[PDB]
């Protein structure tokens, strides 16, 4: 179907302890493929997927220089935003940047985005037309005026509709064996009596990809959202994901409840009953 | 490939 390439930047200032900590990571869909850590010994952009190691030495030299310059851009931005908010030199602060592009099944550009944060809340973001910015507060309005005068939106749009879409296609081609796959979840169910009159039914879903999935409970065919525990989707560590959903049922009525599993890799939504 | 535009904030 659709596919995405996304980069995530994190810059954390360390007052009195040297340069800020800069970490960059690249994703194709839910699969990390590159990383840079400013505190690592290599001081290089590093591969994190087998299919990206095909790139020649020009690729890694280029990305290393480009991501190192980004670390300096954020270092200066930390100082500038530290002045915008009248903050002291002692506190540690964070800048986060997310950006990327999406392509449809025809391989053509579908959508682009870029979003920046400061201390874990919105700062500035490129609008969906890729021609204007939304600023979260008065400080970000200063950044917005600089970015308009410098034609940053047009420069960002030319990357999003050009090199981003182009290299995302090459990546999808190189890692065609693993990026274009849909592993269905393996489902089972556990039962734990908690008291003399109640019990816990837990519905499991393991080894699925991509990460999106819907685990819902029903009682006598009626969806029940009460007494429902639902943890976040977690990575198994091998590219697949895990999730479970549990309900507290009265003892003896366990067979009145059904679990329903919906995933992209399933030809028909699964139904489970104890 | 990376490509965040780096106009100073």
């Amino acid at each position, epitope marked *: 179907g659709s596919h995405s390439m996304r980069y995530f930047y994190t810059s954390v200032s360390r007052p009195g302890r040297g340069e800020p900590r800069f970490i960059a990571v690249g994703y194709v869909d839910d699969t990390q493929f590159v990383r840079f850590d400013s505190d690592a010994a290599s001081q290089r952009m590093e591969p994190r997927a087998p299919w990206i190691e095909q790139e020649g030495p020009e690729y890694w030299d280029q990305e290393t220089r*480009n991501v190192k310059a980004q670390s300096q851009t954020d270092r200066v931005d930390l100082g500038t935003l530290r002045g915008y908010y009248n903050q002291s030199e002692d506190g540690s602060h964070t800048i986060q940047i997310m950006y990327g592009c999406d392509v449809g099944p025809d391989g053509r550009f579908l959508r682009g985005y870029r979003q920046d944060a400061y201390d874990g809340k919105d700062y500035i973001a490129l609008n969906e037309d890729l021609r204007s910015w939304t600023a979260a507060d008065m400080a970000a309005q200063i950044t917005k005026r600089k970015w308009e005068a410098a*034609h940053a939106a*047009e420069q960002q749009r030319a990357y999003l509709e050009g090199r981003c879409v182009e290299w995302l296609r090459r990546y999808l081609e190189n890692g065609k064996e693993t990026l274009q796959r849909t592993d269905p979840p393996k489902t089972h169910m556990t039962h734990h009596p908690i008291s003399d009159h109640e019990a816990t039914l837990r519905c499991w879903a393991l080894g699925f990809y991509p990460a999106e999935i819907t685990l819902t409970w029903q009682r006598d065919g009626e969806d029940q959202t009460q007494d429902t525990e639902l943890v976040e989707t977690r990575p198994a560590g091998d590219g697949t994901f895990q999730k479970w959903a549990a309900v507290v049922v009265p003892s003896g009525e366990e067979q009145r409840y059904t679990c329903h599993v919906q995933h992209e890799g399933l030809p028909k939504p699964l139904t489970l009953r104890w | 490939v990376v490509g965040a535009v780096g106009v100073g904030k």
Partner: T-cell receptor
Amino acid sequence: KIIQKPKYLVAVTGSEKILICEQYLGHNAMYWYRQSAKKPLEFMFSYSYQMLMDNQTASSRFQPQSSKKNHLDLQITALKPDDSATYFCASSQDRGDSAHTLYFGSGTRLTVLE
Amino acid sequence: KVQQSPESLIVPEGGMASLNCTSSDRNVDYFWWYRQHSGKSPKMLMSIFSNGEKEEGRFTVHLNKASLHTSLHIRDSQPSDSALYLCAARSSGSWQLIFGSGTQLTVMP
């Protein structure tokens, strides 16, 4: 604006010279270009935050000096008469891949003589 | 990489001056027009980052991203406009302006 010294410079074949360039505008990118009768503006060096970003001089005899902030001096060893040209220093507020306007210094006219 | 046309142009005072500039890099999405008087430094005249015309005084810059083409129109040409006009591009991802061979414009009083 941007200070370049000296205005004129003469050198013999095989000597070394240093072209000085400094800006006090808080600009985060500095560049070197060369102007000859052949090519009016050949790009040489691009620096962002004192780090080397790109170099389109096929000769290793050109060695910029960027250890000090706001400076991008250019040292040229084993000078040749083909190096005779006006060398323009340039700077811009934002880093090299994102700048919207380049400001050019007054230039150093270099003549290498046999 | 950046091609300019024509190499030299002589225009009478008050006449029209049309300068052309194309690129072969598909990743070029914008251009700069610089002007350099004899013995001076090159100074930026016009920049353009989107398709269409952009007018400032007697100068109009045109951008055609499809044909990778930019043109500088000078109306009511004055003798002070006599200079070397330089076209520059910077493909997405690269770190410097790359200039063309220039058009030498001479406006006779």
